[PDB]
């Protein structure tokens, strides 16, 4: 069962974060209401001294306030935050942070970003090759609606297939066809139509000498 999602962050390790489209108007409503409260009771720069593991608000590059978690307190000027509804990370001074009211906690609305990885693909070990694959996915799917299916679990996050929402084309397969990633083979019957296939796409890419396959 493919589920509609909005892709918000692609990581340098070729993982990505998504929001569930079904809960998106609720996120927008919570953000509306949270920022209403912030405009009425403006955070004083430096009045919040953060601690590791706390939820807070943080002012992003667009000048808007978002929900965040404090991951590391390096110094008062260098607080490492994770934007819990989007999945991106940032180092900020405490002057761009404020307290998160209980009205807007993760108990009122859970963190909206969930981490996933592509099923049936190996993340390239070479940094430059990995960068090419990451850059391609960012251009392909960042800030777009996709359809997601969970394929299997892993030692880390779940591994999934993604389809472009309009065209229904398989995102991960497109990376394989472009020679940006290698196939990670799965044996299971339920995966056979998809895998043997991904392996035939890897052949298209090996023949066109694309990206990973440029030199044989």
């Amino acid at each position: 069962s493919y589920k509609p999602v909005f892709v918000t962050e692609i990581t340098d390790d070729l993982h990505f974060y998504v929001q569930d489209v079904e809960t998106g108007t609720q996120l927008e409503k919570l953000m509306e209401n949270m920022r209403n409260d912030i405009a009425s009771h403006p955070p004083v720069e430096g009045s919040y001294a953060p601690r590791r593991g706390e939820f807070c608000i943080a002012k992003f590059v667009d000048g808007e306030w978002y929900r965040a978690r404090v991951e590391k307190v390096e110094s008062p000027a260098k607080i490492h935050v994770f934007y819990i509804d989007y999945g991106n990370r940032e180092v900020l001074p405490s002057t761009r942070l404020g307290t998160l009211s209980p009205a807007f906690s993760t108990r009122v609305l859970p963190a909206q970003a969930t981490e996933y990885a592509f099923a049936f693909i190996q993340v390239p070990q070479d940094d430059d090759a990995r960068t090419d694959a990451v850059d391609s996915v960012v251009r392909d799917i960042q800030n777009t609606q996709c359809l997601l299916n969970v394929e299997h679990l892993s030692a880390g996050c779940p591994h999934v297939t993604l389809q472009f929402a309009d065209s229904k084309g398989d995102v991960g397969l497109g990376l394989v066809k472009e020679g940006l990633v290698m196939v990670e083979v799965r044996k299971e019957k339920q995966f056979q139509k998809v895998i043997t296939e991904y392996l035939n796409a890897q052949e298209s890419a090996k023949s066109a000498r694309l990206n990973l396959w440029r030199y044989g």
Partner: peptide
Amino acid sequence: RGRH
């Protein structure tokens, strides 16, 4: 949708 961005943000920027």
